[PDB]
Amino acid sequence: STGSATTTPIDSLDDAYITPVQIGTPAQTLNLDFDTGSSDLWVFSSETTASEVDGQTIYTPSKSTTAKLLSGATWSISYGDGSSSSGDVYTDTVSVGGLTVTGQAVESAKKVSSSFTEDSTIDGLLGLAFSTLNTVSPTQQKTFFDNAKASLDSPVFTADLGYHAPGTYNFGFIDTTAYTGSITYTAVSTKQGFWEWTSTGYAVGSGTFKSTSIDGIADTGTTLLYLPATVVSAYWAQVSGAKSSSSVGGYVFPCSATLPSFTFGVGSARIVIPGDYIDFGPISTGSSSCFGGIQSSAGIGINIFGDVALKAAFVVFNGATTPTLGFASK
Numbered sequence: 001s002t003g004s005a006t007t008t009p010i011d012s013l014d015d016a017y018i019t020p021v022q023i024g025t026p027a028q029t030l031n032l033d034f035d036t037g038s039s040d041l042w043v044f045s046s047e048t049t050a051s052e053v054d055g056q057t058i059y060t061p062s063k064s065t066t067a068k069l070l071s072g073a074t075w076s077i078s079y080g081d082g083s084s085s086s087g088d089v090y091t092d093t094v095s096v097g098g099l100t101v102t103g104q105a106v107e108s109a110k111k112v113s114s115s116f117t118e119d120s121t122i123d124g125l126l127g128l129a130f131s132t133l134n135t136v137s138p139t140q141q142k143t144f145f146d147n148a149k150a151s152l153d154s155p156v157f158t159a160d161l162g163y164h165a166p167g168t169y170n171f172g173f174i175d176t177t178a179y180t181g182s183i184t185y186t187a188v189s190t191k192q193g194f195w196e197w198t199s200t201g202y203a204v205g206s207g208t209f210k211s212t213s214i215d216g217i218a219d220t221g222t223t224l225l226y227l228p229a230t231v232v233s234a235y236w237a238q239v240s241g242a243k244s245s246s247s248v249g250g251y252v253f254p255c256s257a258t259l260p261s262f263t264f265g266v267g268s269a270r271i272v273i274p275g276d277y278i279d280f281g282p283i284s285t286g287s288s289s290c291f292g293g294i295q296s297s298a299g300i301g302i303n304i305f306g307d308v309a310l311k312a313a314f315v316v317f318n319g320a321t322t323p324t325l326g327f328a329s330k
Contacts, residue, residue: 001151002172003099007034007161010121013280014307015223017161018122019169022095023106024064030057030123034169035221036159036195036317037304039133039143040077041094042085042107043124044116052112055120059108067092067106075107075135080222080300085112089136094144096126099171101148105134105141125221128157128317133193145171145319155319159220160330161311163277179314179328184269188323192302194219195317197325199305200267202227204235205260209270216303218310218317218325224280225262225273226297226304235262235294242292248283251292255282262294264309266327273312 007017018031023043030043044053046060061067067090076086087110094104109124116122127134131142149155152172160178161167168178189196194217201211214227232251236242238260242253253259259275278293293308316326 001099001148002153002170003095003097003148004168004170005097006166007169008166009162009164010119012164014161014164014311016122017167017220017307019096019126021126023059024061024092025066026064027095028057028059028064030059031121032124032126033122033221034126034128034159035219036128037217037219037221038077038079038125039127039129039131039193040075040107040135041105041124041126041144042075042077042087042109044112045087045108047087048109049111052117054117057123059106059124061090061092061106061108064092066102070105070136070139070141073105073136073139073141075137077135080304081115083113083115085109085116087111089141096144096171097169099148099152101144104144104147105136107136128220129195130190130193132190145317148172149319157317157319159310159315159317161220161307163274163311167311174316179330181329183314183316183326183328184266185316185318185324185326186266188325190323194302195323195325200265202231202265203263203270204238205275207238209263209265211265214264214303216297216305218305218315220307220310222304222306223293223308224304224306225294225308226300226306227294228303229296229298232294232296235260236292244296248289248291250295252283252289253292255288255290257290264305269327271309271313271327271329273309277308277312
């Protein structure tokens with residue numbers, strides 16, 4: 001089997017991408033944030049505290065003839081950005097782009113933090129990291145990909161995120177028309193539960209490539225590119241007037257600037273992020289100070305190849321017995 005679904009930016013900055021997901025019988029379609037940095041499939045639901053729902057589409061398990069309460073199971077998650085959610089668990093039929101999993105754990109939110117309430121466009125998350133990170137207790141549950149992978153033609157999924165445009169998540173096959181050149185594969189460590197890999201270096205604009213190992217995670221659920229402070233300083237030094245602002249929370253730059261590209265290494269291959277992908281617009285409406293898309297990881301504890309980096313590439317998440325990551329230009 002295979003599946004293919006279009007993923008769409010939630011706003012004009014590509015802050016996140018939503019993909020339609022069919023849950024239950026008859027189908028209830030919710031727009032979920034596919035997140036390769038986490039491993040819970042959770043949804044706004046008929047059980048969510050009413051004051052914490054503001055425009056989202058909800059899953060109502062009582063209206064699904066295939067929903068079954070997973071007795072005794074609870075879940076609770078906190079994300080790297082400080083947001084969180086928690087609730088109970090149903091199993092139900094879940095389909096993405098024509099690919100169907102029966103008995104998928106669907107984590108129904110009873111509580112969500114304010115940042116979720118305030119984003120009416122995201123109806124929940126679909127985690128695509130390794131199932132060892134799933135938060136369901138007392139019996140940990142499998143991700144959608146883990147449940148589907150034995151049935152897939154090939155045990156892979158691909159992320160092809162658009163710049164200011166829709167893109168595609170595919171399951172079970174590699175669309176050879178979706179990228180240019182070849183795909184360069186690189187080793188993955190699953191020891192922390194993430195798609196963790198080591199970049200071979202970077203360049204700023206037309207500058208020389210610096211060979212240096214940068215360990216980090218491929219994370220579709222994070223907007224920006226978070227890298228070591230040395231690397232980030234070298235980038236922003238090439239933008240006149242750019243500075244790190246403690247009050248804003250990162251590097252800002254004059255909105256009148258033209259940004260240089262940023263290149264990262266994948267083995268001997270190179271992925272180029274155009275300068276325009278690094279512009280996240282005014283810090284507040286009407287400001288001439290703009291927020292940068294490359295930021296320091298120094299306060300995180302891990303480097304994160306988020307959407308800014310991933311949308312410059314066609315990315316293969318190879319879930320074979322020994323997982324690997326693949327990157328191609330497009």
